[PDB]
Design an enzyme around this catalytic site. Structure first.
Site, PDB file in Angstrom:
ATOM      1  N   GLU B 121       0.817  -1.206   0.000  1.00  0.00           N
ATOM      2  CA  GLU B 121       0.000   0.000   0.000  1.00  0.00           C
ATOM      3  C   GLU B 121       0.853   1.259   0.000  1.00  0.00           C
ATOM      4  O   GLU B 121       0.563   2.214  -0.730  1.00  0.00           O
ATOM      5  CB  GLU B 121      -0.935  -0.032   1.216  1.00  0.00           C
ATOM      6  CG  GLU B 121      -1.642   1.261   1.548  1.00  0.00           C
ATOM      7  CD  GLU B 121      -2.468   1.175   2.846  1.00  0.00           C
ATOM      8  OE1 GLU B 121      -2.796   0.049   3.293  1.00  0.00           O
ATOM      9  OE2 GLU B 121      -2.800   2.242   3.412  1.00  0.00           O
ATOM     10  N   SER B 175      -9.211   5.856   6.080  1.00  0.00           N
ATOM     11  CA  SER B 175      -9.952   5.398   7.255  1.00  0.00           C
ATOM     12  C   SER B 175      -9.231   5.834   8.529  1.00  0.00           C
ATOM     13  O   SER B 175      -9.829   6.446   9.423  1.00  0.00           O
ATOM     14  CB  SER B 175     -10.110   3.870   7.215  1.00  0.00           C
ATOM     15  OG  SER B 175     -10.711   3.439   5.991  1.00  0.00           O
ATOM     16  N   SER B 178      -1.809   7.310   8.015  1.00  0.00           N
ATOM     17  CA  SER B 178      -0.414   6.884   7.965  1.00  0.00           C
ATOM     18  C   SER B 178       0.464   8.074   7.609  1.00  0.00           C
ATOM     19  O   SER B 178       0.102   8.890   6.753  1.00  0.00           O
ATOM     20  CB  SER B 178      -0.192   5.770   6.922  1.00  0.00           C
ATOM     21  OG  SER B 178      -0.899   4.583   7.254  1.00  0.00           O
ATOM     22  N   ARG B 190       7.543   4.402   7.062  1.00  0.00           N
ATOM     23  CA  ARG B 190       6.307   4.779   7.743  1.00  0.00           C
ATOM     24  C   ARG B 190       6.691   5.265   9.134  1.00  0.00           C
ATOM     25  O   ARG B 190       7.083   4.467   9.993  1.00  0.00           O
ATOM     26  CB  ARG B 190       5.320   3.612   7.820  1.00  0.00           C
ATOM     27  CG  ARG B 190       3.936   4.013   8.374  1.00  0.00           C
ATOM     28  CD  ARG B 190       3.003   2.806   8.487  1.00  0.00           C
ATOM     29  NE  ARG B 190       1.594   3.165   8.707  1.00  0.00           N
ATOM     30  CZ  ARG B 190       1.037   3.244   9.919  1.00  0.00           C
ATOM     31  NH1 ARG B 190       1.774   3.019  11.001  1.00  0.00           N
ATOM     32  NH2 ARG B 190      -0.247   3.567  10.050  1.00  0.00           N
TER      33      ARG B 190
HETATM   34  N1  LIG Z   1     -17.942   9.000  -0.986  1.00  0.00           N
HETATM   35  C1  LIG Z   1     -17.280   8.696   0.197  1.00  0.00           C
HETATM   36  N2  LIG Z   1     -17.639   7.635   0.914  1.00  0.00           N
HETATM   37  C2  LIG Z   1     -16.986   7.373   2.027  1.00  0.00           C
HETATM   38  N3  LIG Z   1     -15.994   8.072   2.528  1.00  0.00           N
HETATM   39  C3  LIG Z   1     -15.582   9.167   1.860  1.00  0.00           C
HETATM   40  C4  LIG Z   1     -16.223   9.505   0.653  1.00  0.00           C
HETATM   41  N4  LIG Z   1     -15.642  10.626   0.169  1.00  0.00           N
HETATM   42  C5  LIG Z   1     -14.676  10.993   1.005  1.00  0.00           C
HETATM   43  N5  LIG Z   1     -14.623  10.125   2.057  1.00  0.00           N
HETATM   44  C6  LIG Z   1     -13.647  10.217   3.144  1.00  0.00           C
HETATM   45  O1  LIG Z   1     -12.509   9.476   2.724  1.00  0.00           O
HETATM   46  C7  LIG Z   1     -12.089   8.610   3.782  1.00  0.00           C
HETATM   47  C8  LIG Z   1     -11.485   7.351   3.165  1.00  0.00           C
HETATM   48  O2  LIG Z   1     -10.333   7.770   2.431  1.00  0.00           O
HETATM   49  P1  LIG Z   1      -9.459   6.707   1.598  1.00  0.00           P
HETATM   50  O3  LIG Z   1      -8.111   7.351   1.299  1.00  0.00           O
HETATM   51  O4  LIG Z   1     -10.186   6.235   0.350  1.00  0.00           O
HETATM   52  O5  LIG Z   1      -9.285   5.517   2.637  1.00  0.00           O
HETATM   53  P2  LIG Z   1      -9.054   3.946   2.533  1.00  0.00           P
HETATM   54  O6  LIG Z   1      -7.886   3.745   1.673  1.00  0.00           O
HETATM   55  O7  LIG Z   1     -10.353   3.338   1.965  1.00  0.00           O
HETATM   56  N6  LIG Z   1      -8.741   3.555   4.069  1.00  0.00           N
HETATM   57  P3  LIG Z   1      -7.306   2.885   4.467  1.00  0.00           P
HETATM   58  O8  LIG Z   1      -7.439   1.338   4.525  1.00  0.00           O
HETATM   59  O9  LIG Z   1      -7.095   3.269   5.871  1.00  0.00           O
HETATM   60  O10 LIG Z   1      -6.045   3.284   3.607  1.00  0.00           O
HETATM   61  C9  LIG Z   1     -13.361   8.286   4.570  1.00  0.00           C
HETATM   62  O11 LIG Z   1     -12.992   7.925   5.908  1.00  0.00           O
HETATM   63  C10 LIG Z   1     -14.092   9.652   4.508  1.00  0.00           C
HETATM   64  O12 LIG Z   1     -13.623  10.521   5.549  1.00  0.00           O
HETATM   65  C1  LIG Z   2      -2.425   0.692   7.043  1.00  0.00           C
HETATM   66  S1  LIG Z   2      -4.126   0.514   7.363  1.00  0.00           S
HETATM   67  O1  LIG Z   2      -4.851   0.523   6.140  1.00  0.00           O
HETATM   68  O2  LIG Z   2      -4.290  -0.610   8.217  1.00  0.00           O
HETATM   69  N1  LIG Z   2      -4.525   1.854   8.192  1.00  0.00           N
HETATM   70  C2  LIG Z   2      -4.069   2.305   9.446  1.00  0.00           C
HETATM   71  C3  LIG Z   2      -4.088   3.643   9.839  1.00  0.00           C
HETATM   72  C4  LIG Z   2      -3.642   4.007  11.093  1.00  0.00           C
HETATM   73  C5  LIG Z   2      -3.177   3.080  11.992  1.00  0.00           C
HETATM   74  C6  LIG Z   2      -2.723   3.490  13.288  1.00  0.00           C
HETATM   75  C7  LIG Z   2      -1.331   3.398  13.677  1.00  0.00           C
HETATM   76  O3  LIG Z   2      -0.447   3.393  12.839  1.00  0.00           O
HETATM   77  N2  LIG Z   2      -1.010   3.298  14.966  1.00  0.00           N
HETATM   78  C8  LIG Z   2       0.386   3.214  15.300  1.00  0.00           C
HETATM   79  C9  LIG Z   2       0.822   3.796  16.624  1.00  0.00           C
HETATM   80  N3  LIG Z   2      -0.228   4.011  17.648  1.00  0.00           N
HETATM   81  C10 LIG Z   2       0.172   4.238  18.962  1.00  0.00           C
HETATM   82  C11 LIG Z   2      -0.769   4.012  19.983  1.00  0.00           C
HETATM   83  C12 LIG Z   2      -0.417   4.227  21.331  1.00  0.00           C
HETATM   84  C13 LIG Z   2       0.898   4.643  21.544  1.00  0.00           C
HETATM   85  C14 LIG Z   2       1.410   4.883  22.883  1.00  0.00           C
HETATM   86  N4  LIG Z   2       1.783   5.081  23.943  1.00  0.00           N
HETATM   87  N5  LIG Z   2       1.754   4.832  20.520  1.00  0.00           N
HETATM   88  N6  LIG Z   2       1.428   4.654  19.328  1.00  0.00           N
HETATM   89  C15 LIG Z   2      -1.633   3.964  17.320  1.00  0.00           C
HETATM   90  C16 LIG Z   2      -2.015   3.287  16.026  1.00  0.00           C
HETATM   91  C17 LIG Z   2      -3.136   1.749  11.640  1.00  0.00           C
HETATM   92  C18 LIG Z   2      -3.576   1.353  10.374  1.00  0.00           C
HETATM   93 MG   LIG Z   3      -5.912   3.849   1.637  1.00  0.00          MG
END
Ligand SMILES: Nc1ncnc2c1ncn2[C@@H]1O[C@H](COP(=O)(O)OP(=O)(O)NP(=O)(O)O)[C@@H](O)[C@H]1O
Ligand SMILES: CS(=O)(=O)Nc1ccc(CC(=O)N2CCN(c3ccc(C#N)nn3)CC2)cc1
Ligand SMILES: [Mg+2]
Ligand SMILES: Nc1ncnc2c1ncn2[C@@H]1O[C@H](COP(=O)(O)OP(=O)(O)NP(=O)(O)O)[C@@H](O)[C@H]1O
Ligand SMILES: CS(=O)(=O)Nc1ccc(CC(=O)N2CCN(c3ccc(C#N)nn3)CC2)cc1
Ligand SMILES: [Mg+2]
Lengths: 352, 352
Positions: B121, B175, B178, B190
């Protein structure tokens, strides 16, 4: 005048009161009836009105302060009720800190001849923290940690020595969060802060669950399952995200499962309370960890009243700081966590 | 086979599709009817079923890719609807990234003879970001910033040159969040992440306001006043906290005024939506700022779909990063912010 230290925060007023115990027969005569009435009122009650509480377990007994022996008492009440406190006072040198020392300055001055001395909130925190650690908690350690926080069968509270406390990262979790880097008794900086603090926990909890008190919010959270509301790494990947060492159980999106209407309709109030607690606590730990790495400090002490009677958040901080730092940082806790500003204010009395 | 790049996230699937425009007369004959049906279906519609959308404004026209000329199209639909997509596909080499490339691997393999190649990713994000910036947005800048973000009468979108992009801090708001430190095309890490991301905005907004869509949440937030829910520095101090340079308008406690029952009863849904947006956005900016200082990087680019059609959050990030960094950091934004992973996946096709 009575010796008092007051920290008027955004949510709670904290009061430290020094009760002399070496009163001579002659001194007792020269005591005015109002002063005797105050001392007896404070020492013969543990609840004051409807919202004041004396934290009797925290009392420091037979402390030598300003050349006299006495007991140091710790009292709290909501800032919302400060008008009642001031009105009781209208029918003394007050060292006061916190934002309310400024906001309510004119109100304190309605007490005739009262001298108000405003002291800085973070200067008082550092001074009071160092002082209480130095005198000890009635011979016991003021500072503690959770040993083997990674293994629950072994995780237990253990004392921690702070005889040479520097450097120290202090994370003050009140209404919001302030983070301090303490390099010496006279060298400290506010590194940053976050607005996701104790007031966020209580405010969001009340909106989401209808709870009417901090203790009720914690009791709900103890019964809940935060993963009913949060979206985890394993919900996104089907398991761990191995490439970047994210375990499947880590929260990827706090409240992220609440984008689905069917999940909003099945989640319980207790689950939402626990998700609020976990979200706020993890964010605080994560910000603390980043500040520690940037400040090159490995001891992180968490204070403020968000952690009062809140073992869930303390254990989560202990585990999370150790886990995500790969053992490089240690979460430290203090028995008098909410009262250091009030003590530091009291300690400023000889200046005036 | 058609040339597709897919990023299956926790919330949205993003698809990049390369449409060849240099098809010779002979090549058109050798095209099977299903392939012609796919190309015409994708290029003659902008909505696909009930939840797929082609972002026509983002199309890259007359791009030379893999030695052929064509148009690069950008398509999205909810991950919840991936079963419909796969079912449509059952009645090709697929380069796929995101957590769903792993979670739904076996589902993609129900398409006979389909070869699924899972790609990382964050590797795909970096590769796609660098690629799109390199080819430009149809001759316009892919990267932009808000000039004079401190003064609203002057604040305006302006192009930003990323010809030498390193080093770069990439903040991917999906969601969750990162944060990447990019030192070269093949050297990136990261740094950390936070779980307070786009899914937190949408999930909390739905719980607090009953909104049924991201766009509805943003429209509510545009009408709200976040200070009805948040406790500000001036609510605690009566003004600025001068000693540490905190202005009275800064948020001391997000949702912190919701600890008061009377304030919970007067706050509007729009105020709560705006407080949710401000809370999440400020936390992201603050974490970005700490990561930038620790990484010694001064260019911070924000991507992901939390910022799609979300000028409020972009302007808040631009202002907050500049204000709280005292002008040392600059918030950067990209036109193709949600699609870089999908493009990077497509770019991996020659490997297989
Ligand atoms: N049409 C939509 N439907 C849902 N969410 C939306 C929409 N448009 C914008 N968003 C926002 O976009 C965010 C998701 O962004 P996105 O970059 O596509 O994440 P993702 O890749 O699906 N999640 P991740 O697994 O964490 O990388 C949602 O949490 C909303 O805040
Ligand atoms: C790649 S994904 O699509 O899965 N999306 C995705 C997006 C965000 C995260 C969150 C994350 O990276 N973390 C790392 C470090 N965190 C903490 C918590 C407590 C303390 C203390 N004391 N320190 N660090 C919290 C959570 C995970 C996955
Ligand atoms: Mg994403
Ligand atoms: N009895 C209580 N009433 C209210 N809040 C409580 C209570 N007990 C614990 N708390 C928690 O303690 C937090 C306040 O901690 P505290 O350190 O006293 O902050 P403060 O100093 O009043 N705020 P600040 O102006 O930001 O320094 C609240 O936000 C709650 O999360
Ligand atoms: C002393 S108190 O009693 O008033 N309590 C109190 C507690 C916490 C705070 C919060 C705080 O310190 N901050 C500072 C830095 N913040 C940001 C925001 C966005 C970006 C970006 N990009 N960077 N930094 C957010 C808010 C204030 C007061
Ligand atoms: Mg305080």
């Amino acid at each position: 005048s009575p010796w008092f230290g007051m920290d008027i925060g955004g949510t709670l007023v904290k009061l430290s009161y020094f009760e002399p115990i070496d009163i001579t027969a002659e001194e007792e005569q020269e005591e005015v009836e109002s002063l005797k009435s105050i001392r007896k009122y404070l020492t013969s009650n543990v609840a004051y009105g409807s919202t004041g509480i004396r934290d009797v377990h925290l009392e420091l007994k037979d402390l030598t302060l300003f050349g006299r022996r006495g007991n140091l008492h710790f009292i709290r009440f909501p800032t919302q009720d400060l008008p009642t406190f001031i009105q009781m006072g209208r029918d003394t040198v007050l060292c006061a800190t916190g934002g309310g020392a400024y906001k309510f300055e004119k109100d304190f001055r309605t007490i005739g001849n009262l001298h108000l001395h405003k002291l800085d909130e973070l200067d008082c925190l550092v001074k009071g923290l160092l002082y209480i650690d130095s005198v000890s908690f009635n011979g016991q350690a003021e500072c503690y940690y959770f040993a083997n926080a990674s293994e629950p069968e072994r995780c237990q509270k253990m004392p921690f020595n702070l005889d040479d406390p520097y450097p120290l990262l202090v994370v003050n979790i009140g209404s919001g969060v302030s983070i301090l880097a303490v390099h010496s008794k006279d060298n400290y900086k506010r590194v940053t802060g976050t607005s996701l603090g104790g007031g966020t926990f209580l405010g969001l909890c009340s909106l989401l669950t209808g709870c009417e008190s901090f203790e009720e919010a914690l009791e709900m959270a103890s019964k809940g399952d935060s993963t009913q509301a949060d979206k985890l790494v394993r919900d996104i990947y089907g398991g761990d995200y191995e490439r970047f060492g994210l375990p499947g159980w880590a929260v990827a999106s706090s409240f992220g499962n609440m984008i689905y209407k069917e999940k909003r309709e099945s989640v319980s109030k207790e689950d939402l309370a626990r998700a609020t607690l976990v979200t706020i606590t993890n964010n605080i730990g994560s910000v603390a960890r980043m500040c520690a790495v940037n400040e090159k400090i490995n001891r992180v002490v968490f204070v403020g009243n968000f952690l009062r009677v809140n073992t869930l958040s303390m254990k989560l901080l202990a585990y999370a700081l150790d886990y995500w730092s790969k053992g490089q940082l240690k979460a430290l806790f203090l028995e008098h966590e909410g009262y250091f500003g009030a003590v530091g204010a009291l300690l400023g009395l000889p200046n005036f």
